[PDB]
Amino acid sequence: ELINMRRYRNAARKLIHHYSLNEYKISDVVMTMIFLLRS
Amino acid sequence: LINMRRYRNAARKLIHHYSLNSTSSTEYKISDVVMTMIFLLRSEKYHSLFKLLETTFDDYTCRPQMTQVQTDTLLDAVRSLLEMTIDLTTVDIMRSSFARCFNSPIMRYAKIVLLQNVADKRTTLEELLIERGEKIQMLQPQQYINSGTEIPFCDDAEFLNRLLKHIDPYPLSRMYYNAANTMFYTTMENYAVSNCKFNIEDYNNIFKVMENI
Amino acid sequence: IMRSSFARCFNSPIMRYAKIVLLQDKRTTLEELLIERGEKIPQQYDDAEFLNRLLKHYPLSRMYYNAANTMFYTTMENYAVSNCKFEDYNNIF
Amino acid sequence: PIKLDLCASVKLTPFKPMRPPKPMQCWIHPRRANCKVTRPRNDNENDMLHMTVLNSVFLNEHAKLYYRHLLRNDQAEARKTILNADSVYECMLIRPIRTEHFRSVDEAGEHNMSVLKIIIDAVIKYIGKLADDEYILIADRMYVDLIYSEFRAIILPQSAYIIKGDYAE
Amino acid sequence: NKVRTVTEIVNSDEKIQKTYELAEFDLKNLSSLESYETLKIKLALSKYMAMLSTLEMTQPLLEIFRNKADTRQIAAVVFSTLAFIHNRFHPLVTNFTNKMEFVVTETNDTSIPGEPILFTENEGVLLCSVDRPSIVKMLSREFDTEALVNNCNVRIAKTFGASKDFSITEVEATQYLTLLLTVEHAYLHYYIFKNYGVFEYCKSLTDHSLFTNKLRSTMSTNLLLSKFKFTIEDFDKINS
Amino acid sequence: NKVRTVTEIDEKIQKTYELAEFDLKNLSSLESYETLKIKLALSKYMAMLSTLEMTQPLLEIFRNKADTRQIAAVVFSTLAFIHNRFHPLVTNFTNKMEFVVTETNDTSIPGEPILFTENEGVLLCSVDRPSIVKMLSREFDTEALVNNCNVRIAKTFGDFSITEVEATQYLTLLLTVEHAYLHYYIFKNYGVFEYCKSLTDHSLFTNKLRSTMSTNLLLSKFKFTIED
Amino acid sequence: ALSKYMAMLSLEIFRNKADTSTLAFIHNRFHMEFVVTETSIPLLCSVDRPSIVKMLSRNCNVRIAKTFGAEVEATQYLTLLLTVEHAYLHYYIFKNYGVFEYCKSLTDHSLFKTSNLLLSKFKFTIED
């Protein structure tokens, strides 16, 4: 597996959840966007 | 599908800035790093650098290891993307920049940093100088210019005037910028590799002295 | 990550004991310096046109200045190396 | 608001000799207006300085800001008092190492019990420098303000009062 | 500020008065000064490169530095550059100590940060430490000869008022400027050496502010660098 | 500071001189001279030890659990040599000295293994030979250097059997019997009372030495302390 | 006098240490064993050669009217001559006053034909 998909799922979930709400890091955005790209 | 042209441009400019080779200065956004790293994820040849920048997301104290042929493969890949030669210190610069980027969270403004996260036993300038002086004193001066050798001043006035017209369009201010920036880059990287604390303060005291005189 | 945590733990110093660390005005009078030196003190046994040419080949003030400051600075160096206390110089000049 | 025993008892405008900082905020103590962070514009990657605005009431008879009476072997690189009329200003120079930073006691919630151990050691020896017959009072809170890195802890200026007792033997 | 010159005729009281904003003439003075400085800098560079060409430099400086083997050329070019600099500070002087030596540093173990070029006399004559890899990487640094580098009103004024072959680009101009500046700083260090001793050389290396003490007396009576002022972006916060 | 000298014959030209260079040269000469003198004294003393027919090394002189005669010989030699150091005119000690060589912790007082307490008729020197061996039982770091930045960097840019280690033991014994000699001085000058007081507080040596010794010392070359 | 001294001469002599008329010329102006030291105060004639090495090695209107009308060796040599002249003066004290008076002159110089000598023709001063 190129990217462990679990943390990608989790990061995407939490980032989008906080955005919907209205603590994070740029690397987190990187993991979420690559979660996206893989999906 | 995506625009490999823009992705390549972003990746190239970003590495140029991180490697300090380019005296050019430009602000980079999150979009830019996304652009570059997606390019890497698309560049099968550069997927080795892609794994390296993936591993940089880790504790950022690790030093990755790879076999020699893997090493020259990485070097050829980075040379191909840069179309400069290049060396492993540039790779360490890349990795340290990626680590210092990831660990830095999003902010409304750019945080200006100094090169660190390299190597491990903190070193000063004084004993660094001691070692340099000892080794150089132990090394024979391979050259010898004798007498008060005449300066070959090119007295040809028209030669100097053609040189002048040929350099007149040059914005000398840009020349100052590029030269000073490259000087600073080499000085600071030599400090980082030597693991000697770079002292920006006296570096600026140089400019202060210039202003005074 | 946990491996790296252990790595840094290994990279932490531990207790030591106390150590006697190390750390690296009076001007010698002329009399004893001169005594020692002398105690420590034999090996070897008109033209007008040329004069004018020498003359033609220099601000005199600056030249005497350079020579005099040279000699004064060397005398100060000799005093410093000898630890010797330094007016008699003015008596010379 | 100043008067005089003079028959006119003229109004005397309380001119302030110095110029207090305009940006009166502190990321270490954002709520504390009297806390003014000033990372000195210079291990030096984390050099530090901070000025605390207090009332001159906490000054003693010999012109000394009370809490300073129990600081010995002061790890703080620099520290001294200033006054601009009633207001006063304590500026403390510090410089942790690159991998070291100091953090406000406020809302610390620190789980490292040994860091708490060093903090409590600092404060306990501090108050131990007190004299038995001498009583102390604090006018800001029921605690002492302090900032601290894992490596060391540095007391903050305090609303301190020094009242001396007299035990009749 | 303002000057109100009176034009009149003594025959009658008829008088005339013109205010003259000295700012425009001060700006003309400043523009003439900047043009003259640019010209002198460019002609100094022209002389330097012309004497380099007369130094039978075949391959441009860049791969002169890439050349490990031809230390003859490295010594010749460094000696010529330092000669040109000292002549700039000493137009009368055009030759140096009879004997000269040059030593090259080719690794981190031999190359120092900050001052890749150094000197440490062998107690009889001064030897020229020169870090070839450092300058190799210096020139190898990609360059920005397209993005112009910088009061807005006076800037617009100088813009609009400004009524705007051997193979060389502006990149080598950057390269030669950088070499001249590095050798300038190194030569200042070596001036400190020759003028005050090796100990003072060392302390000035450790503290470039001492160049103010030792050269505000002499050099200012200026630098090629002194044309502009230089600093670090947002140096204030950088310091903290 | 700065000392400017004006030289002229109206044309006036004034030079400026920095006294820092003179201070530098003066200091460097001072440390070189002091190191030379200290090594000279060490060489002289170890040479008179060599002439003391000690065919066995000083550590062996402490492996002699039984032979306290040579222990007394070396103690008297060191003490008389130090007495000459502070009294170059005198090269000898009072007629008789008595020696007892302690051999246990309960017979050795911490800090002062060497001591001089009178038996009410004459001073007796109590020395714990095992303690002295423990002094000499520690390997000495003769490999890594020991320690202003600018002065240090600039100055850096400026056959019978003996070793650096042996020189270390010689310096150690010299300074130890030196401290013991200071105690003996307090004794001979101001009684049982004051030598004991100097033993308790060695700050007493301060005020007791400005009288004579200041009018110097091996150890004065360096200054010592403990960390933080 | 400087040109005459140059002419009869016709740091390098101080470079070759083993290579160890000026005094006679100065004697003529104002009117013998040799030894050279290498280590130096801050008829034998001692010569502190290291000191000598340290010596040797170490109107607008008128101008414009003229316009419209259209050396290191010198310092070294004069410094060396002045040093040799002071040495000759002290040797003269030795000859004409005595050994002890010569030493007193060395220690203190206030105690002191002269016109030809170039030392009397200029003044040098020192400021705190």
UniProtKB/Swiss-Prot annotation, chain A:
It is found in: Host nucleus; Virion. Transmembrane segments: none annotated. Forms a complex with proteins E27 and p78/83. The interaction with p78/83 mediates nuclear translocation of P78/83. Interacts with protein Ac102. Interacts with IE0. Belongs to the baculoviridae C42 protein family. Plays a role in host nuclear actin polymerization by recruiting p78/73 protein that is capable of activating an actin-related protein 2/3 complex to initiate nuclear actin polymerization. This is Protein C42. It comes from Autographa californica nuclear polyhedrosis virus. The chain holds residues 112 to 155 of 361 of the full protein.
Curated annotation (Swiss-Prot), chain D:
Coiled coil: none annotated. Disulfide bonds: none annotated. It comes from the Viruses. It is found in: Virion. Structural protein that participates in nucleocapsid assembly. Plays an essential role in the proper localization of the major capsid protein VP39, and the minor capsid protein 38K into the capsid assembly site. Interacts with C42 and VP80. Interacts with protein 38K. This is Protein AC54. The gene is AC54. The chain holds residues 7 to 180 of 365 of the full protein.
UniProtKB/Swiss-Prot annotation, chain F:
The gene is E27. It comes from the Viruses. It is found in: Virion membrane. Belongs to the baculoviridae E27 family. Interacts with host mus209/PCNA, cdc2 and cdk6. Forms a complex with proteins C42 and p78/83. The keyword Secreted does not apply. GO terms for cellular component: membrane; viral envelope; virion membrane. This is Occlusion-derived virus envelope protein E27. Acts as a cyclin-like protein and plays a role in the modulation of host cell cycle. May promote G2/S arrest by interacting with host mus209/PCNA, cdc2 and cdk6. The cell cycle arrest is characterized by an intact nuclear envelope, concomitant with sustained activity of host cdc2. However, viral DNA replication still occurs in the arrested cells. One of its GO terms (biological process) is symbiont-mediated perturbation of host cell cycle progression. The keyword Membrane applies. InterPro entries: Baculo_ODV-E27. Keywords: Host-virus interaction, Membrane, Modulation of host cell cycle by viral cyclin-like protein, Modulation of host cell cycle by virus, Viral envelope protein, Virion.
Curated annotation (Swiss-Prot), chain G:
It comes from the Viruses. It is found in: Virion membrane. Belongs to the baculoviridae E27 family. Interacts with host mus209/PCNA, cdc2 and cdk6. Forms a complex with proteins C42 and p78/83. Acts as a cyclin-like protein and plays a role in the modulation of host cell cycle. May promote G2/S arrest by interacting with host mus209/PCNA, cdc2 and cdk6. The cell cycle arrest is characterized by an intact nuclear envelope, concomitant with sustained activity of host cdc2. However, viral DNA replication still occurs in the arrested cells. This is Occlusion-derived virus envelope protein E27.
